[PDB]
Design an enzyme around this catalytic site. Structure first.
Site, PDB file in Angstrom:
ATOM      1  N   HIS A 122     -18.490  -7.774  -1.280  1.00  0.00           N
ATOM      2  CA  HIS A 122     -18.999  -7.218  -2.519  1.00  0.00           C
ATOM      3  C   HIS A 122     -18.782  -8.237  -3.633  1.00  0.00           C
ATOM      4  O   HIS A 122     -17.845  -9.037  -3.595  1.00  0.00           O
ATOM      5  CB  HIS A 122     -18.258  -5.896  -2.774  1.00  0.00           C
ATOM      6  CG  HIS A 122     -18.632  -5.173  -4.030  1.00  0.00           C
ATOM      7  ND1 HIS A 122     -18.434  -5.702  -5.291  1.00  0.00           N
ATOM      8  CD2 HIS A 122     -19.110  -3.916  -4.217  1.00  0.00           C
ATOM      9  CE1 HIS A 122     -18.824  -4.820  -6.198  1.00  0.00           C
ATOM     10  NE2 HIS A 122     -19.242  -3.731  -5.572  1.00  0.00           N
ATOM     11  N   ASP A 199      -9.678  -6.503  -0.066  1.00  0.00           N
ATOM     12  CA  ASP A 199     -10.497  -5.552  -0.810  1.00  0.00           C
ATOM     13  C   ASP A 199     -10.609  -4.308   0.053  1.00  0.00           C
ATOM     14  O   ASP A 199     -11.372  -4.285   1.019  1.00  0.00           O
ATOM     15  CB  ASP A 199     -11.860  -6.152  -1.124  1.00  0.00           C
ATOM     16  CG  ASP A 199     -12.831  -5.138  -1.711  1.00  0.00           C
ATOM     17  OD1 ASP A 199     -12.466  -3.948  -1.838  1.00  0.00           O
ATOM     18  OD2 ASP A 199     -13.969  -5.534  -2.046  1.00  0.00           O
TER      19      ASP A 199
END
Ligand SMILES: *Cc1c(COP(=O)(O)O)cnc(C)c1O
Ligand SMILES: *Cc1c(COP(=O)(O)O)cnc(C)c1O
EC number: 2.8.1.7
Lengths: 405, 405
Positions: A122, A199
């Protein structure tokens, strides 16, 4: 076992109607709906407990400060941190990753060093490293993907060397649902003295997460995808590292003393990265969202979602010219395109049937480029979705294909 | 006119009990209580309208995006900005001021320039400038105070020169209640080509605020002190300036495109400084908090609070060895010490009577130093406080003085 019907009853939004049809919310991966217990916890705080938390004198303030610190404790147990003081409250995953890149990155990554990310990241886990690498003159290396949407692990020997300071990797892809082999990659990273930031924004809600067992150095995730309020996330940091990180964005409870003649000093660990007034409402609600998920059991949640996914992937076999992206053992999200139709159009038709899915680049453009498409559709299959909602999606894709084909 | 009784009925917390006595919340300046209309607006959003706002495809998402942008419009009218695109949503006043110091400050303040603040600034309006001045080699100048707690205006000729890039000044002191002559000071600042950032955190809730008439260049304030939720503030910027500010803390809706080979690009004005997922819950509630205050009328609010203050200051004359800090025409807050007793002790006794006041340095240490005290007590007198609460405070101080004297 685990009752969808009893869970769904907790979420008032699922009774909603869109375009005069009953809503099939399949976009949890963008942001999750919230149960009543979370919504009212926040509201009750405001109605009967509200005060500033600047470790203040009177009773309401002292009680609010204790509430907030209890949530920090609850969150540390949730991910099995050793200590609550290893957790920092942040506005969200995006801001947490940047926090690490500014405080830790600027002090530990010099000219000629390199940082490793993956191609499925992302944007929140790309842009901060791209900029850190510019500031200090370091190199951003990228683990490439395989067609099935897994990382090309064979390339790690060409990317990890003595000058690699950090691996920043996603736990679960927000587009493909790939779950990366974090434990093993962290072992490799630590053999070179490199740190690992994970993440975790798409992982903490699908199954238990144990940061000690992972041994990751940083771990970040988002409240609003964990069935919690907006405006709040969690950044975990190993105590040894956290007590070494210098300051950055200075405010209030981050600032200790300030002098016009002598300068300012900053307060100790967790709190030093929490400037200004904390989002106490958000914190209260995240607390409740953690209690709710724990009351259901992440292993029960994992089991139900995993079977909903097997069902969905089986039913989707009967959709003509469906293209799926990712592995067979995806968690949470299904990424696809329908024949040659723009994902924008497909999503618009599904919304017309009251089915919400996400279309576009999903804040992962490099990943779209890898597959040589501009966009994809993505359906999330979360703990409150049902076989019927999967059937509506399958039928809808069949109808869109007959109509537009 | 204006009915306290009808207003108080809107705030569920005011019925609360502390230490078995009825609560007299006199600490609004730290953070305001919230009316029901604000609490339920947020909760209703979560129960029936919730979705991600990443300008997304399906109906719930499209409707949430419109909700959020309507709040931006409502807030621009509230302070009389020319355009809604001059407003940025921030986590709070602290983060807004830092935003300006990083984006605008780093591009417009060079070695040998200077910046002007005042000695009554909250730390949020000091530390970012102290650090900007270090980064770039500039000088931080300070407007000093007079004993009555007003700025020594006669010193401005020695502080403003051709190299002054910015005046950063508070609208209303969070400790003294002084209201500074912003309009005139901005005229002087603009004669030298210097910009003005106004810290408005203690002003927007006491009377109308018109940023066009002020002609300030930046204006920042906090949601949670405007009877709104935590985790949300407003940063106003002149359009001409805002469309020139470079990027900084990059995320999601701040990031336009990102490429592993070609780099990333950032989106246009307001949105470019709003990384990651916005605090949509907070935004919804701030919206309602603006509607509620507007429905009452800031001129009605000003009138009632001003008379509550005159009453309070009259009654406090009958408190022995009371020391007051600030001017006669204070807004909102009363700062004092009682004889030679530590403010910590005085505050503890008042809390014991169920009266909440703030004690300590109030995030304004330079201001404490000016008065040669380590701390003060501060009582806020907001739109839902009463003559009776003032009487309890006066009586309480009299009793503490008899007991500890
Ligand atoms: C959504 C998400 C982010 C962004 O988190 P925010 O809460 O929006 O700041 C980052 N990484 C992944 C994998 C995500 O799913
Ligand atoms: C409280 C306040 C601040 C800090 O604002 P936050 O919302 O806590 O970030 C800054 N300046 C003044 C004058 C304040 O009253």
């Amino acid at each position: 076992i685990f009752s969808v019907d009893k869970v769904r009853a907790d979420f008032p939004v699922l009774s909603r109607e869109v375009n005069g049809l009953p809503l099939a919310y399949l976009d949890s991966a963008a942001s999750a709906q919230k149960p009543s217990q979370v919504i009212d916890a926040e509201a009750e705080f405001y109605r009967h407990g509200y005060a500033a938390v600047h470790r203040g004198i009177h009773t309401l303030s002292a009680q609010a400060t204790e509430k907030m610190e209890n949530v920090r404790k609850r969150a540390s147990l949730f991910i099995n941190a050793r200590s609550a003081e290893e957790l920092v409250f942040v506005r969200g995953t995006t801001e947490g990753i940047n926090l690490v890149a500014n405080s830790w990155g600027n002090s530990n990554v010099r000219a000629g060093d390199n940082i490793i990310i993956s191609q499925m990241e992302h944007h929140a886990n790309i842009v901060p490293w791209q900029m850190l690498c510019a500031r200090v003159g370091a190199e951003l290396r990228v683990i490439p993907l395989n067609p099935d949407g897994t990382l090309q692990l064979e390339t790690l020997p060409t990317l990890f060397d003595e000058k690699t300071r950090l691996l920043a990797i996603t736990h679960v892809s927000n587009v493909l649902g790939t779950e990366n082999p974090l434990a093993e990659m962290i072992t490799l990273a630590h053999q070179h003295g490199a740190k690992v930031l994970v993440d975790g924004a798409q992982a903490v809600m699908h199954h238990p997460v144990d940061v000690q067992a992972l041994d990751c150095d940083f771990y970040v995730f988002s409240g609003h995808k964990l069935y919690g309020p907006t405006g709040i996330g969690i950044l975990y940091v190993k105590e040894a590292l956290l007590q070494e990180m210098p300051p950055w964005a200075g405010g209030g409870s981050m600032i200790a003393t300030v002098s016009l003649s002598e300068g300012t000093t900053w307060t100790k660990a967790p709190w030093r990265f929490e400037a200004g007034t904390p989002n106490t409402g958000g914190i209260i609600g995240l607390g409740a969202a953690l209690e709710y998920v724990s009351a259901l059991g992440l292993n029960n949640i994992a089991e139900y979602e995993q079977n909903l996914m097997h069902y969905a992937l089986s039913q989707l076999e009967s959709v003509p010219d469906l293209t799926l992206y990712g592995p067979q053992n995806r968690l949470g999200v299904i990424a696809f395109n329908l024949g040659k139709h723009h994902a924008y159009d497909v999503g618009s038709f599904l919304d017309n049937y009251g089915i919400a899915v996400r279309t576009g680049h999903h804040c992962a453009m490099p990943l779209m480029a890898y597959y040589n498409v501009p966009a994809m559709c993505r359906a999330s299959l979360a703990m409150y979705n049902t076989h019927e909602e999967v059937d509506r999606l399958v039928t809808g894709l069949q109808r869109i294909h007959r109509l537009l084909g």
